[PDB]
Ligand binder design. Structure first.
Ligand SMILES: C[n+]1cn([C@@H]2O[C@H](COP(=O)(O)OP(=O)(O)OP(=O)(O)OC[C@H]3O[C@@H](n4cnc5c(=O)[nH]c(N)nc54)[C@H](O)[C@@H]3O)[C@@H](O)[C@H]2O)c2nc(N)[nH]c(=O)c21
Ligand SMILES: C[S@@+](CC[C@H](N)C(=O)[O-])C[C@H]1O[C@@H](n2cnc3c(N)ncnc32)[C@H](O)[C@@H]1O
Ligand SMILES: [Zn+2]
Ligand SMILES: [Zn+2]
Lengths: 294, 120
């Protein structure tokens, strides 16, 4: 059971290239729970970080990380603390949630993510947001708006070239537009943790934003492919990947941050961006505050 | 939810919490225990987890009564000692991490818990 020792499963091109209708997701072990040593979200976030450890993430000094949906019913934020454990010590963590909570982030903003004003461009976006009304399933599974509209605009405007995103989706909490935006990164997948393998949950990963269409994606068809993959793939609940944490911390890559105009972005720059070796954005001081909306 | 509202009805939240759990009250739950390689230095508060084999590491904000209860921190600098950092708790005291931090102090020269690691 080698896959039990990996942090999870990543959607393969075998299923990315399929052409099927959107079917209902039917998992054999649906909603089964694995006992923890420790909140389950500790193991879920660590396994997400472990998979990102195998991705070409840009890791600069003063790394700008925003974490949406960081709170919980208990008023605490296990995922943010895992991000603190994982990220460089000088990384800037901003987290946010509709409801009040306390966390180990540098900046914590309460309220709807739409109230979160990002003054500059960030390097990594983690979203665990999920709207409770998604459970009121009625008449066919259509693309959702909700916080996905905000996240799509963020990718197009407030994400550094070379930056990455990890955005939680489920069978019914997903967005056509977000899938299609994955074609603007050097690479993309959906990653499902072994700790929560019994859920249709997956983290839609966009690795190294390029600001331009690299892959033309039919977002509706691709979600149908994602569900096709989940329906075809046995996934055993496991946290074996967390037994050896000797190399858990994100590699201190010292990724450079450069300011370039659009005209200067040649093939060399695009190559460096695609390899996780470059970020293009401002290098001022990060300003992320709560906006007063109308 | 009961003990947190208890420390909001008094001028000494530290004493109010300690008196509560010393009189049999249930310690505050949902402290964020981390999974760590038990190969750390063992200091009290650290930027990364530093648990030894006899310790467990918690997210700092979650074991701070003033953070958990959303009350003013007593530090004259206004900045919390634990928030944004990791706190090592002796394994025999994980039943009440919030109570442990209120009852103990790190060695200001040595950075280890006095009585739980400090050798000065
Ligand atoms: C995949 N599936 C869906 N349904 C039906 O689809 C409807 C919409 O699904 P939906 O998109 O929520 O997705 P899932 O329920 O995975 O999300 P799941 O709840 O994991 O996760 C959704 C959100 O809940 C959060 N969450 C779920 N459990 C917990 C928990 O125990 N603690 C905390 N704190 N959060 C939880 C989770 O993190 C995420 O934010 C659901 O109501 C299903 O009944 C299925 N029915 C059967 N029989 N078999 C299935 O395989 C199946
Ligand atoms: C599964 S929980 C987050 C669990 C958390 N990541 C952890 O580490 O335990 C889903 C969170 O999404 C938050 N959320 C949902 N919609 C949101 C929105 N529109 N803006 C900000 N937060 C939102 C919910 O309030 C809830 O706290
Ligand atoms: Zn505090
Ligand atoms: Zn000492």
């Amino acid at each position: 059971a080698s896959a039990d020792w990996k942090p999870g499963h990543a959607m393969p091109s075998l299923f990315k290239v399929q052409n099927v209708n959107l079917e209902r997701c039917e998992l054999a072990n649906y909603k089964q729970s694995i006992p923890m040593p420790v909140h389950m979200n500790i193991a879920k976030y660590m396994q997400l970080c472990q998979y990102l450890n195998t991705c070409t993430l840009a890791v600069p000094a003063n790394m700008r990380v925003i974490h949406f949906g960081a709170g919980s019913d208990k008023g605490i934020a296990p995922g943010t603390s895992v991000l603190r454990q994982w990220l460089p010590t000088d990384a800037i963590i901003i987290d946010n949630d509709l409801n009040e909570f306390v966390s180990d982030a540098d900046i914590t903003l309460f309220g709807d993510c739409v109230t979160v004003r990002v003054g500059q461009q960030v390097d990594l976006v983690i979203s665990d947001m999920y709207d409770p009304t998604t459970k009121n399933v009625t008449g066919s599974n259509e693309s959702k708006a909700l916080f996905f509209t905000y996240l799509c605009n963020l990718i197009n405007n407030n994400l550094a070239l070379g930056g990455s995103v990890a955005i939680k989706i489920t069978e019914h909490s997903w967005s056509v537009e977000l899938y299609e935006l994955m074609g603007k990164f050097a690479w993309w997948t959906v990653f499902c943790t072994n700790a929560n393998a019994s859920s249709s949950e997956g983290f839609l990963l966009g690795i190294n934003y390029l600001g331009t269409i690299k892959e033309n994606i039919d977002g509706g068809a691709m979600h149908a492919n994602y569900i096709f993959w989940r329906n075809s793939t046995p996934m055993n609940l496991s946290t074996y990947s967390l037994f050896d944490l000797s190399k858990f911390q994100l590699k201190l890559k010292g990724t450079p941050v450069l300011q370039l105009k659009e005209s200067q972005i040649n093939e060399l720059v695009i190559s460096l961006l695609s390899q996780g070796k470059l970020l293009i954005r401002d290098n001022d001081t990060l300003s992320v505050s709560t906006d007063v909306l109308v | 939810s009961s003990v947190l509202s208890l420390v909001n009805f008094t001028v000494d939240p530290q004493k109010a919490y300690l008196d509560f759990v010393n009189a049999g009250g249930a310690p505050l739950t949902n402290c964020v225990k981390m999974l760590t390689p038990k190969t750390g230095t063992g200091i009290a508060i650290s930027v990364k987890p530093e648990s030894t084999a006899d310790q467990e590491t918690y997210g700092g904000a979650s074991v701070c009564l003033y953070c958990r209860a959303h009350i003013e921190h007593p530090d004259v600098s206004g900045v919390c000692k634990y928030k944004g950092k990791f706190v090592q708790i002796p394994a025999q005291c994980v039943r009440d991490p919030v109570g442990f931090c209120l009852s103990n102090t790190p060695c200001n020269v040595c950075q280890y818990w006095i009585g739980y690691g400090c050798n000065c």
